[PDB]
């Protein structure tokens, strides 16, 4: 009865270790051999890469992650009115430093002048809740005018 009690609890504990070995084998595949889009799977922050180090009866993953910092508050808009057109960013967001408008990428502040190259049109000024008027620079125009 003492040996049956020990084997039963070793069988239940082997199932806990095997669930953890399946998890470790999956972090190996997805975090180490790949880059993971799964939030908080390969550590807190946006995952960059992971390095396995062995340990007694285990594995240790050194999860390298990009963590964003030093926020600035900006005024923002869903779309920009130009000559009737509503313009949306191809990637990024519209942001304003009070007096001027830029498009920046979402995860780092890199303000670009708003143009027909970094924005796309869809419909017109009437439809969008909270569209904000601002010029959209067309990069071809000076190349004809000069």
Partner 1 sequence: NGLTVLPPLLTDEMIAQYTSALLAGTITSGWTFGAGAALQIPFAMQMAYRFNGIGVTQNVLYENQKLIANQFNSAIGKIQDSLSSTASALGKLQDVVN
Ligand X SMILES: *[C@@H]1O[C@H](CO)[C@@H](O[C@@H]2O[C@H](CO)[C@@H](O)[C@H](O)[C@H]2NC(C)=O)[C@H](O)[C@H]1NC(C)=O
Binding site for a second copy (CB under 8 A): 1, 4-5, 8-9, 11-12, 15-16, 18-19, 22, 26, 29-30, 33-34, 36-41
Question: 109, 115 in Cβ contact below 8 A?
Answer: no
Name 58's bridge partners: 55
Subset of residues 117 to 146 that bind partner 1, contact rule: CB under 8 A: 120, 122-123, 127-130
Which one among 9, 26, 97, 112 touches ligand X, defined by CB under 6 A? 97
126 binds ligand NAG (CB under 6 A): no
Cβ partners under 8 Å of residue 108, min gap 6: 68
Question: 69, 123 in Cβ contact below 8 A?
Answer: no
34 binds partner 1 (CB under 8 A): no
Which one among 5, 130, 142, 143 touches ligand NAG, defined by CB under 6 A? 130
Question: Helices (H), strands (E): how many in the chain?
Answer: 2, 10
Give the whole-angstrom CA distance, residue 38 versus residue 79.
30
Q: 97 touches which of ligand X, a second copy, ligand NAG, none (CB within 5 to 8 A by kind)?
A: ligand X
Instruction: Summarize as ranges the residues that interact with ligand NAG (CB under 6 A).
Output: 71, 73, 129-130
């Amino acid at each position: 009865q003492s040996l049956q009690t020990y084997v039963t609890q070793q069988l239940i504990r082997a199932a806990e270790i095997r669930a953890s070995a399946n998890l470790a084998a999956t972090k190996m595949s997805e975090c180490v051999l790949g880059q993971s889009k799964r939030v908080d799977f390969c550590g807190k922050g946006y995952h960059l890469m992971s390095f396995p180090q062995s340990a007694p009866h285990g594995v240790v993953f050194l999860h390298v992650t990009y963590v964003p910092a030093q926020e600035k508050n900006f005024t923002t808009a869903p779309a920009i009115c130009h000559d009737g057109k509503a313009h949306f960013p191809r990637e990024g967001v519209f942001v304003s430093n009070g007096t001027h408008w830029f498009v920046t990428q979402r995860n780092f502040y890199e303000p670009q002048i708003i143009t027909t190259d970094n924005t796309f049109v869809s419909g017109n000024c009437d439809v969008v809740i909270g569209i904000v008027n601002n010029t959209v620079y067309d990069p071809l125009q000076p190349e004809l005018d000069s």
